């Protein structure tokens, strides 16, 4: 799977938002993937990580983060404030099928747009 | 929210399969939130735990799939290999519900992409 | 949030005209504010849209010569501009808001001309 | 980008199921997830129009459930319930991207 750009839909509270971000090269040390969106300043965007690693067993990784800008008074760059991370990692073996994977990429894909969790994370109240 | 049934829909590989989950109690040690299928077997259980966090808000969420295969010479099944899964969000103290929301929406979107689908399905880098 | 333009008006010949749109209540940081026309009974046609995270300065073809878009970030007040009048100053005009690529979720009423 | 849309004048009275279809010049399937931008609005003959329907599947809030659309790759349609006392006037069709384009009529 090439890189190339990626046009998320139907995002955000109220469900009319999107975001469009772009490839930014692959990194050789640890041969991770990168992607952002063009804010016009490199340090408040977007930005997502992609890797998928080789046995003994295979294990996949996503990582999500997010800065917010605030440009406080006494200065002219805006810094940065507070950030919203995220992760995901999976955890597959040697003899998995691609039923198994599938299921459980649907299975989290689909858990994620439930009462429960919707509920869970957006107003950070436990479940019981 | 309290725990109730809970049911997926166009769930699997062509989306016609479906998954019906009932909750499983609230441990009470360090207050996770279980939930498991009726597969009139313990063992050979899907299960699903989700619990908050208090102070940076923690959020997790851990998926478990165990694949069972008729032993030879014996009677019970057993569990051979299995499936994890991991989500952990972070957010702060003065993060408001827009941010969490897209965080969210976008980790949900993101995860139907066709970038995703061939690096789990697959197993191919990018 | 709501937004209403200001007045019908009147011009004669070809001379330049001053159309702006009021908008209280929301932020330019991420909405663009579209210029849709409709001219008269039937039909509709796009004109251009300022927004500061794609440029701010596109516009539907063979309209650059009869269109100039400016915003005043202080009083949060946009408002364009028409340069020659033959057709062009022929019906009602409108203003509308919107996300970043979603849809256009709310209009004012527009001035006739 | 054309948008082409039903001749311009129905003549539904009461009662009747109508539907509205439309047509597009190029395949709408921009988002890497299959979403469409598609969008209905309706227009009554004296103030601006309104939103009813974004993505071409989803309802705006504050819509009665009597409107339904379904889309298609390159082929859609908005079906309503059977026409109540106030569902005259002008519908308009718009996709939302890149370069924004209506077209059409009632």
């Known amino acids: 799977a090439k890189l190339e750009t990626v046009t998320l839909g139907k995002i955000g509270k109220d469900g009319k938002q999107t975001l469009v971000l772009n490839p930014r090269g692959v990194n050789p040390t640890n041969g991770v993937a990168s992607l952002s969106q063009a804010g016009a300043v490199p340090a408040l965007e977007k930005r997502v990580t992609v890797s998928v690693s080789q046995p003994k067993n295979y294990k996949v990784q996503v990582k999500i983060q997010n800065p917010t800008a605030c440009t406080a008074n006494g200065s002219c760059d805006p810094s940065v404030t507070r950030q919203a991370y995220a992760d995901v990692t999976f955890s597959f073996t040697q003899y998995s099928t691609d039923e198994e994977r599938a299921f459980v990429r649907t299975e989290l894909a689909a858990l994620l747009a439930s009462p429960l969790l919707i509920d869970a994370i957006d107003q950070l109240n436990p479940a019981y | 929210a309290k725990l109730e049934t809970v049911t997926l829909g166009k769930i699997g590989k062509d989306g016609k399969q479906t998954l019906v989950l009932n909750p499983r109690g609230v441990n009470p040690t360090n207050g996770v939130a279980s939930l498991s299928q009726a597969g009139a077997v313990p063992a050979l259980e899907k299960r699903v735990t989700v619990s908050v966090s208090q102070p940076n808000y923690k959020v997790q969420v851990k998926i478990q799939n165990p694949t069972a295969c008729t032993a030879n010479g014996s009677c019970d099944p057993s569990v051979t290999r299995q499936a994890y899964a991991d989500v952990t969000f972070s957010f702060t103290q003065y993060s408001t519900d827009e941010e969490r929301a897209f965080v969210r929406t976008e980790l949900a979107a993101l995860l139907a992409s066709p970038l995703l689908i061939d690096a789990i399905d697959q197993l191919n880098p990018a | 949030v709501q937004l209403q333009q200001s007045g019908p008006e009147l011009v004669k010949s070809g001379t330049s005209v001053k159309l702006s749109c009021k908008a209280s209540?929301?932020?330019?940081?991420?909405?663009?504010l579209h210029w849709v026309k409709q001219s008269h009974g039937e039909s509709l046609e796009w004109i251009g849209y300022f927004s500061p995270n794609n440029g701010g300065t596109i516009y539907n073809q063979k309209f650059m010569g009869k269109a100039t878009l400016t915003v005043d970030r202080s009083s949060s007040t946009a408002y364009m501009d028409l340069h020659n009048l033959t057709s062009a100053d022929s019906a009602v005009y409108f203003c509308?808001?919107?996300?970043?690529?979603?849809?256009?979720?709310?209009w004012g009423q527009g001035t006739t001309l | 980008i054309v948008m082409s849309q039903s001749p311009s004048s129905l003549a539904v009275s009461i009662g009747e199921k109508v539907t509205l279809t439309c047509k597009s010049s190029?395949?709408?399937?921009?988002?890497?997830?299959?979403?469409?931008?598609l969008a209905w609005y309706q227009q009554n003959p004296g103030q601006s129009p309104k939103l009813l329907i974004y993505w071409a599947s989803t309802r705006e809030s504050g819509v009665p459930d009597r409107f339904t659309g379904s889309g298609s790759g390159t082929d859609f349609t908005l079906t309503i319930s059977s026409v109540k006392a106030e569902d005259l006037a002008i519908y308009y069709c718009q996709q939302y991207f890149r370069y924004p384009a209506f077209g059409g009529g009632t």
């Open positions: 209540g929301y932020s330019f940081t991420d909405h663009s």
């Open positions: 509308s808001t919107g996300w970043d690529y979603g849809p256009f979720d709310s």
């Open positions: 190029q395949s709408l399937l921009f988002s890497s997830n299959q979403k469409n931008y």
